[PDB]
């Protein structure tokens, strides 16, 4: 319903960021990509559909691939998010900056979730992070909170090197074959709860971070 939500699990917030301490009291944070928790409005239009077959090649296609997952279903769990990344940090990144991802999910059931994040280049897996997160009772729902999960070294290098490129159009040519695949499962059952394909593009004209959601369909 304009929400990146499975019948079982909803992604409430997603942030990848860099934090620097300017002085003992003062911290500065820059967000590269963001998804902020918004409540669905009755007046909002349904998410557009993107055929899952069209993006198979951008993610690995092997067991544990997007096709096999989509075959296992549930098909209402799979979404696509297109990020416009704010690369104009405008802060002095310095030895000692923290590079992290913070996110929040929500559920009507309590479970132990497991979060697979697969970085991918030309459709090939470069890195997999696996995180376990636990249910916490909030107002009328269970919520899962990942605070400041550290970025892996590959991505820190990728961000800096990317930033170093003279021109935004070259950042976009690189990002065309850069993708991340997120697969949340219930840990002990391994049932698929939420799958999000992440595609990226720099913000040519910078208004800061932007994003767009799409429902992956197999019609
Ligand atoms: C452990 C491993 F999961 C990891 O390190 N991750 C996973 C989650 C994630 C999702 C997006 C970005 C990101 C994408 C584009 C840009 C830029 F704007 F620069 F293009 C900057 C950051 C970085 C990460 C970090």
Curated annotation (Swiss-Prot):
GO terms for biological process: asymmetric neuroblast division; embryonic organ development; female pregnancy; hippo signaling; positive regulation of transcription by RNA polymerase II; regulation of transcription by RNA polymerase II. GO terms for molecular function: DNA-binding transcription factor activity; DNA-binding transcription factor activity, RNA polymerase II-specific; RNA polymerase II cis-regulatory region sequence-specific DNA binding; RNA polymerase II-specific DNA-binding transcription factor binding. The chain holds residues 217 to 435 of 435 of the full protein. It is found in: Nucleus. The keyword Nucleus applies. Signal peptide: none annotated. Its main location: nucleus. It comes from the Eukaryota. Residues 1-219 are annotated as: Transcriptional activation. Keywords: Acetylation, Activator, DNA-binding, Nucleus, Phosphoprotein, Transcription, Transcription regulation. This is Transcriptional enhancer factor TEF-5. The keyword Ribonucleoprotein does not apply. Disulfide bonds: none annotated. Transcription factor which plays a key role in the Hippo signaling pathway, a pathway involved in organ size control and tumor suppression by restricting proliferation and promoting apoptosis. The core of this pathway is composed of a kinase cascade wherein MST1/MST2, in complex with its regulatory protein SAV1, phosphorylates and activates LATS1/2 in complex with its regulatory protein MOB1, which in turn phosphorylates and inactivates YAP1 oncoprotein and WWTR1/TAZ. The lineage of its organism: Eukaryota, Metazoa, Chordata, Craniata, Vertebrata. One of its GO terms (cellular component) is nucleoplasm.
């Amino acid at each position: 319903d304009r929400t990146i939500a499975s019948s079982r699990l909803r992604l409430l917030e997603y942030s990848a960021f860099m934090e620097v301490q300017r002085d003992p009291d003062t911290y500065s944070k820059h967000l590269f990509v963001h998804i902020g928790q918004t409540n669905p409005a009755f007046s909002d239009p349904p998410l557009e559909a993107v055929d899952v077959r069209q993006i198979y090649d951008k993610f690995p296609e092997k067991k544990g691939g997007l096709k096999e997952l989509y075959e296992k279903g549930p098909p209402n769990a799979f979404f696509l998010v297109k990020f416009w990344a704010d690369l104009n940090s405008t802060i002095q990144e310095g030895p000692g900056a923290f590079y992290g991802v913070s996110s929040q999910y929500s559920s009507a059931d309590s479970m132990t979730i497991s979060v697979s994040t697969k970085v991918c280049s030309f459709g090939k897996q470069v890195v997999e992070k696996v995180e376990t997160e636990y249910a916490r009772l909030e107002n009328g729902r269970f919520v899962y909170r990942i605070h400041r999960s550290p970025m892996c070294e590959y991505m820190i290098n990728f961000i800096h090197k990317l930033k170093h490129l003279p021109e935004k159009y070259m950042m976009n040519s690189v990002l065309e074959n850069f993708t991340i695949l997120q697969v949340v499962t219930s840990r002990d059952s391994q049932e698929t709860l939420l799958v999000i394909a992440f595609v990226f593009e720099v913000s040519t004209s910078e208004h800061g971070a932007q994003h767009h959601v799409y429902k992956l369909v197999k019609d």
